[PDB]
Write a protein that binds this ligand. Sequence first.
Ligand SMILES: C[S@@+](CC[C@H](N)C(=O)[O-])C[C@H]1O[C@@H](n2cnc3c(N)ncnc32)[C@H](O)[C@@H]1O
Ligand SMILES: Nc1ncnc2c1ncn2[C@@H]1O[C@H](COP(=O)(O)O)[C@@H](O)[C@H]1O
Length: 239
Amino acid sequence: MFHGKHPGGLSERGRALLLEGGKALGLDLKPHLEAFSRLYALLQEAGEEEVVVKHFLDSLTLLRLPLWQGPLRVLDLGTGAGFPGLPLKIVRPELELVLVDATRKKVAFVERAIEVLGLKGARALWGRAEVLAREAGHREAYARAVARAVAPLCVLSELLLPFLEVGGAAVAMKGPRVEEELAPLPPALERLGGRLGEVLALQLPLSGEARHLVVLEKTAPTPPAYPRRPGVPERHPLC
Ligand SMILES: C[S@@+](CC[C@H](N)C(=O)[O-])C[C@H]1O[C@@H](n2cnc3c(N)ncnc32)[C@H](O)[C@@H]1O
Ligand SMILES: Nc1ncnc2c1ncn2[C@@H]1O[C@H](COP(=O)(O)O)[C@@H](O)[C@H]1O
């Protein structure tokens, strides 16, 4: 079984892995195979298949929190090649997504993916978080924000919280270990207008690797001091 090949897209095996992992998360990914297969093709053009199908499914674990109903404006901060934002947008088309990265080549890739996949209401944007969050067009302008593989929580919270409207929420995607990053976090969140929401432990669908989704709730406006200038949260983190 699963012998069929594909010159520029997911193989029969890769399609089946994606569907199976999807069903484990509670998702029916059949309507979205072509979109994911195209995205896979784009990545290859820029084990191989399995690993990508895992970036897809890791991104889709966001759907294990019911945070994504309706035309919410969502920021994917530090999106790289479009993760977790592109899979999210594929499976929740009503979301109005902005995908940010400081590296032009990555933003150029996301922009191309958006067009090739024919996504509507997704924009890639080149910029730094610390600078974009001081513009009225982005500061406290999002209902949701997400980030994967960007920074430790104490730094990442200073980067994410300023983009959220009050009442909004951010998800920091993390791996198997979060105790150390969480322990000193609540007092820093309060300085930012945030508070710690749920920390959901879950297992990645095909591999069983441990993951945590860390929810940051926006409870009050962020003081003008934050975020600090580029590089400063990283070198003098709040915790
Ligand atoms: C390790 S990559 C992870 C990319 C993607 N989120 C993923 O998980 O596949 C982190 C990305 O964050 C970007 N980045 C880090 N700090 C940033 C900042 N302060 N503002 C904008 N982009 C940032 C980097 O340029 C890089 O492409
Ligand atoms: N230990 C520290 N904790 C927090 N901020 C600092 C610290 N040392 C310097 N700063 C501030 O961080 C910014 C850059 O400082 P520097 O790292 O000396 O370039 C400046 O606004 C300083 O006022």
